C-alpha cells in the first residue's frame, strides 16, 4: 500500500470536507502559472505579474493583491475569499501570504 496526495492528484473525491476541499481547489489554482495550462493560460497564479517587486512599494503590492484576488474570484465564483494576509519575515528575503476561508489559514512563503 501507498497513499496519495492532493497536489494535482486528489484531496477528496468531491466537496465533503468543505473548507479543506476549497483550500485544495485553490491550491491547484495557485500552483500553476500563466502559459502552463491549455485553454485558459491566464488561469492559475499570476506570479509572472507579481514576482519581484520592491517589498516596500505598498501601493503596488495592494494593487496586485486586489487584482489577483478579484480575478481568481471571478474565475472561481464557488469559493469567495475571507482573509488575505501579507507578513514579512526575519530577513528581507521572506514574505508570507496567508489565505484563510474563515478557518483554513493556509500560508505560502513568497519572495519579492
Amino acid at each position: 500500500i501507498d497513499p496519495l496526495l492532493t497536489l494535482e492528484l486528489s484531496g477528496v473525491k468531491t466537496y465533503e470536507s468543505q473548507e479543506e476541499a476549497w483550500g485544495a481547489r485553490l491550491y491547484e489554482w495557485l500552483n500553476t502559472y500563466q502559459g502552463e495550462v491549455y485553454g485558459d493560460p491566464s488561469w492559475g497564479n499570476v506570479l509572472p505579474q507579481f514576482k519581484h517587486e520592491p517589498t516596500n512599494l505598498s501601493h503596488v503590492q495592494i494593487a496586485v493583491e486586489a487584482m489577483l484576488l478579484q480575478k481568481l474570484t471571478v474565475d472561481l465564483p464557488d469559493i469567495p475569499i475571507s482573509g488575505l494576509s501579507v507578513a514579512e519575515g526575519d530577513a528581507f528575503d521572506k514574505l508570507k501570504i496567508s489565505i484563510r476561508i474563515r478557518d483554513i489559514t493556509i500560508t505560502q512563503d513568497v519572495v519579492l
Binding site: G35, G39, D40, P41, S42
Partner: protein, 115 residues
C-alpha cells in the same frame, strides 16, 4: 432535462473537408493580403507550442488557432516559427458573418449578378 452540447464557433461546423478547404483558402488569401483592416503584429518566442496564445491574449477565444496555423504554415507545434514574422488578423465578426452566409446560403460565393 433538455440539453445538447454544441458551440457555434467551429469553422469545421461544415462537415465537408473540401468546403472547409476553400474556406481556409480565402481566409489565407485575405490574411496574406496586405489589407489595412488586418492586425499588424509579429511572432512571440513561446508561440511555437501555442500559436493560439496570441489569439487568447488579443481576443479571449481560441477559434483563431486554425487561422494562425494556416497563416504560419506550421507542420507541428514541436517545430517553431521565426519570431518577427508579419502576422495579420481580421475582425472576428467578419469571419463569423462570412461563415454564417456560407452555411445558410453559401451558394453563389463568388459573385451574384442579378436574380
Amino acid at each position: 432535462t433538455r440539453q445538447y452540447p454544441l458551440s457555434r464557433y467551429d469553422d469545421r461546423n461544415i462537415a465537408d473537408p473540401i468546403l472547409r478547404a476553400e474556406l481556409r483558402k480565402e481566409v489565407m488569401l485575405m490574411c496574406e493580403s496586405n489589407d489595412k483592416n488586418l492586425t499588424i503584429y509579429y511572432v512571440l518566442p513561446d508561440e511555437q507550442y501555442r500559436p493560439d496564445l496570441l489569439a487568447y491574449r488579443m481576443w479571449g477565444i481560441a477559434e483563431l488557432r486554425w487561422v494562425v496555423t494556416l497563416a504560419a504554415g506550421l507542420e507541428d507545434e514541436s517545430q517553431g516559427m521565426t519570431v518577427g514574422k508579419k502576422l495579420k488578423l481580421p475582425p472576428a465578426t467578419w469571419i463569423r458573418e462570412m461563415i454564417r452566409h456560407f452555411q445558410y446560403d453559401g451558394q453563389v460565393i463568388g459573385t451574384l449578378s442579378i436574380a
